Design a protein around this ligand. Structure first.
Ligand code: ADP
Ligand code: ADP
Ligand code: ADP
Ligand code: MG
Ligand code: MG
Ligand code: MG
Lengths: 413, 412, 412, 405
């Protein structure tokens, strides 16, 4: 009715319709599918459809629907599954009464009202609680390569941690995993859990906006005054989808593909989850790397945005050392605030012993290390299988925070 | 309908007013086809089905059909199919197929997948004892060229047991078609559908042949059966999609590949798994652009599939066949499949292999004197048992009980 | 005075005939400002101050200013300012800033700069005992991600003795503005100006916060007092200017960066320093792309800046904090400042650290007979005194006399 | 004389007919100027020196020239000069300058370069006792950061037997020009004519500073005077001409440098040699990619090292790996062989100090290292002195000949 699609191909369509506000979404008039305006030219507009692009033609019409795409949240979406658009997954249900329409692109809190975080957040993994330590309110990434440890460790965290609300986004991952995550969490956890599931099958728009849907639901349950744990599996799938859309919209390449829109819109997503006046969002994001190099474009940028990074390495997964986290290469930017100095000194000595043995281990496997001459290296070896039975852990085993730090004191000295 | 104005060599472009994208057109005098891949307000980009030589400007295009749907039915069992769905063996009568299916369908709904917990016996002791497969798991075989990908699919054709075996041979040798028919017995070839396009064919017919194999496997899944899909070199699909997408004017995001091969590979690989009725267990051969596993296609297909078996060239040079590197390999579904005792025995055998790989260069140089480590002497002592457990000949298959009891005898 | 013709991601384009550069316009339906960054002879490139929410074609523009100016004055202390210039705390009453200044001034005359002779007491034992800073020196702190740039500015800013501190937090997490105010006591918060912009803010606030901080520092310099300016990740300025200029029709040159970044960064980064009345002393945190050596924006900042502290994460992996690599870092302005015996003690224990970094191998390998290398014998005996002099705690600040006394007893 | 088409950040495009590459044009309302890098059939890509803000569509460009030449005369001795040529300060008034010459002059071909004679005394006693240098010889100094090369340059300006001394502080920092001029006397400044430019200044005039200083030194070469040229940090000329080159548009070849700097640096360095009018002793400093290309292109490298400068042994030069290639054509055979035997008397100490760090080395048969141990301190106070310690040429000769005893 308003315009005509005049260019079909790739991820974006292009239309001819004047006076289009940017970000408004338009329905394809005979064929019930709709598309969001991402950019405008002097008369022609770039649109990104919500579904696949097959079956279209030149001069196909476009109707006007709304100024902004908004999702509809409420308190009646706990224990239920949502896609990236906002509509529910399951159809054996009656769909709930969600009363509050919320926009999808909001603001972070005032930087003066973001308090300092000084309470520990316990995950149940002995390594990430003893050596590193999370805090109630921070956001922390799990940086690994392909098929190393990210999902499993995130399942161990979901099984071990406990918040008032749990919002779990599975964006751009395999569809076989939505029943594994539903199997490894109990009904006492499922009663406070919202899944936002976008499979890797889906278009670029759903796989790009599922992260914002999960962040919007998490901040809705934050504004009621509760501590909500957000867990977002592969924020890099958002980064890939935004790369595809931004390159199809005609933007350059900076730092290995990845237009400036990606590095501009990652902080608009990641700054929305932290401490707040009412409640706080503790966030745990997993990051896939383009090799096992930690110095990726997206790996380095999301490492410079987040408040803690947990680096998992493949050469500790070749050795059946699970969870495969590299202690020397991973850090936790809030553990000097959330815990006493005695735990801090013990964790520092355990990190120093791990790095000392890794500095020595090469000249043990070629038979040149001589015992008794270096006092720091010897104590790095005499405790080696005493520190490692602390640092590696089974999947179905959760630990308490007390015997964790008691094992740490027993392991270091 | 319209006329052709450019011919480049991979894609052509034409003056077609208001063509549906995806609809296939016909070159009018010369009996060839093409399909629409992009539209530019009066000028469509077309990908021809056959070779491009002979065309001229202003050559006409006739219309037929809104999409290229293949013709499928129950009478495909025991016969060979072209990549776009023709019967290849022309010495026999054409089969009667009642149904039409388009090549691009949807995966099953994610809440209807029912996490897999039954084993799938392959016959190779290394992907039965140490790695284990599931009914519904899609597996990858990652190697360099010449390392043994096709030998191992030949080993697991005559050892595995499904209802319908759907074997795609896309992008591979024409000489292979008969050698894969020399491994299949008559009780197995009477239930096998073999979709083969070779490396000579145009880029479309190597692109749209994995989708043909998946559509035939989905038709045989939806009847209530168990399908064993196996593709040979899915990276040949990835390279056909690469040079078509780069001819179509698209940027180069990673290692030479457009983003339209990274967005179109999950909507191929995710259609092969568990289902509300039936199942497809799929095995994909993946060739790596060097011996490095961090090839972009190797990395992306490792991040999509449910288990990877990396074969190295060091073990192919050391005459360790099959050349499965155990530390680099994994199987996601094994902890739901095997018992706790079998999982413990598998983990301890893998730790023995890693311990010997630690002490190997130290004993090769000559520093290892017997007696310091308790695990290194265990590795040296069980070395020969582990080696003749992992190493297996081509004409040998094991049953699952003999595999697990030999695992228990080897591990301790 | 013109219509907007297209909206990009970061950029606006309009038809403003004979418009100047720097002339900022506001959008008539929507109250928000935008300044001109390029001309294309009828068609200008503007950069907006905010996001692009509803931006229809043909939206009008109205002339507001020929250049953008900020309100400065002496009644700015103890406050928080954003990159634009307006106060960021809203519960407080708005102050009275008397004067206005443009953000683009020129560095002082190089024949009228003073001579740096007296030290700037910094607080950390390594950058006082080994790399001493003078009053008027521009040093930079070079590291990768999360290696400890912001923690070292916390240690400096805690134990700083300057008459007025301007702290620029450019393009970093909103969380840490309260963590910097948690280690500013009231005696140094009553005379500090925080120019803070967060990483989610639009492109030119993140591009102009450095100019706002240097403008405020030059104002309080021209009053006549010495002032400490500390920028946190001027690399965020550099890649904000990269994303602005590179999307305005300007070519990649060395890292994705246009030539305009390399034209506008040595003018910003040099208008600090000594002066005929007053002196800005500046500490620039620099983020590096990789941990490599061929960084197109780290190398030339290293070249045009007199003194640099290099933090390497290979010392942050053995938990050696602060991770200062004393061999890779230098201070061109310390031989003019400290006494000669201070130079001898600093050079001697740098020599001891450099000796023990490779005598350490032939201690572990059992090849070191005592006495054959006496200097190494002096670098093994005093290893512990050095490694308590170098790394210190975050809350462990120390005065200058204790640092030089402990330096002398470490070297002796 | 031409309207400005558009502004591309650092590139101006104009609509003006018939201009040559390198012609510099004039922004008339603001008094700024900008030179031509490329022409189209009627439009012209040129690039500004200064900042580009304040410019609009339709500003005029006054012609005022066709190539840039510097107004150079005899009265520039003792004045501060920009890389373009205008003075630095406004307290002094610009004197009479009759002549002007362009910045380009072709060097003679290398097949017929002259013989070197006539020892040229620099003032540091270490090299003119050990690594001497003639009049027309051009010398490269390879020093580091924090090695004390600025005092070395100030003390080879102070005590040189040259009537004119020309130095180009090309790309220096803000403080470092006063840091350098604080250690030059007034008797030296009344002999100097010196070009300064800072990293504030645009890369275009930061690369034309080298040609300006070379051109002024060629002017004082033609008046029958022995003249010394100094160019401090040739590498900063290299990065400035790099920024001009790939700012105009050119892909790089080696390191990050375009081949334009590899065509311009032998052209800039191959000139300024032994002319029959009384010639021009060039001293060019390079810090430690193109140091290979510089070290293979001029005769004589002097190496200053941090491993020697960590002690109090100034000037921080090591004779064991630096040598000026022309000494037999300069100094006599007695002085040459005595200097070379003192060089190998120093070089055998470092192969025997490490063997007397351990307790093994004795006397009895080693006639070259037993002499270094006794006659060490005369060596080690011959090859070092302070900043304002001058040692004339007719003292270092007999001092070196009583060092060899
Ligand atoms: N902590 C662990 N313990 C045992 N096995 C693990 C562990 N982490 C990963 N694995 C194995 O490695 C494979 C990859 O795990 P997963 O976390 O799914 O990888 P990704 O991080 O790519 O999702 C799985 O199939 C699993 O069997
Ligand atoms: N398990 C095995 N037993 C014996 N020979 C093998 C085995 N695997 C590979 N080979 C040898 O290595 C070569 C590569 O096998 P093939 O499967 O054809 O490579 P590709 O995986 O590239 O198709 C073959 O020629 C074969 O002889
Ligand atoms: N001086 C120090 N002492 C102890 N830990 C430190 C020190 N500096 C940095 N760290 C650790 O390293 C990490 C990086 O700190 P930070 O200063 O935020 O790095 P950056 O600001 O450069 O990203 C922190 O999580 C912190 O725990
Ligand atoms: Mg996963
Ligand atoms: Mg094969
Ligand atoms: Mg920081």
């Amino acid at each position: 009715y308003e315009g005509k699609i005049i260019n079909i191909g790739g991820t974006i369509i292009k239309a001819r319709l004047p006076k289009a506000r940017i970000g408004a979404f338009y329905k394809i008039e005979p064929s019930q599918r709709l598309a969001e305006v991402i950019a405008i030219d002097e008369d022609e507009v770039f649109l990104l459809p919500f579904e696949h692009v097959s079956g279209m033609y030149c001069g196909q019409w476009l109707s006007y629907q709304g100024d902004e795409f908004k999702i509809r949240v409420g308190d009646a979406l706990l224990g239920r599954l949502i896609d990236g658009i906002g509509r529910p997954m399951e159809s054996n249900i009656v769909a709930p009464y969600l009363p509050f329409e919320r926009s999808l692109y909001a603001e972070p809190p005032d930087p003066l009202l973001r308090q300092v975080i000084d309470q520990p957040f316990i995950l149940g993994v002995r390594a990430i609680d003893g050596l590193l330590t999370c805090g109630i309110g921070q956001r922390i990434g799990i940086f690994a390569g392909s098929g190393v440890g990210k999902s499993t460790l995130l399942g161990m965290i979901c099984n071990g941690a406990s918040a008032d609300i749990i919002v779990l986004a599975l964006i751009g991952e395999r569809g076989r995993e939505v029943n594994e995550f539903l199997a490894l969490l109990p009904q006492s956890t499922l009663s406070k859990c919202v899944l936002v599931v976008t499979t890797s099958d889906r278009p670029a728009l759903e796989r790009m906006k599922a992260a914002f849907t999960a962040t919007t639901i998490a901040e809705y349950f934050r504004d009621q005054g509760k501590n909500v744990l957000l867990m977002m599996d592969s924020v890099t799938r958002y980064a890939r989808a935004a790369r595809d859309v931004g390159l199809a919209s005609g933007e350059p390449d900076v730092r290995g593909g990845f237009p400036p829109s990606v590095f501009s819109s990652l902080p608009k997503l990641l700054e929305r989850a932290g401490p707040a006046p009412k409640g706080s969002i503790t966030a745990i994001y997993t990051v896939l790397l383009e090799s096992d190099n930690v110095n990726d474009p997206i790996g380095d940028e999301v490492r410079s945005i987040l408040d803690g990074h947990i680096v998992l390495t493949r050469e500790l997964a070749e050795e059946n050392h699970f969870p495969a986290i590299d202690i020397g290469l991973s850090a936790s930017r809030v553990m000097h605030n959330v815990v006493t100095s005695e735990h801090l000194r013990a964790a520092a000595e355990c990190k120093k012993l791990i790095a000392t043995y890794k500095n020595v281990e090469l000249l043990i496997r070629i038979g040149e290390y001589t015992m008794g001459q270096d006092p720091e290296a010897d104590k790095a070896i005499k405790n080696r299988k005493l520190i490692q039975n602390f640092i590696q852990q089974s999947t179905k085993d959760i630990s308490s925070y007390e015997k964790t730090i008691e094992s740490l004191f027993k392991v270091v000295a």
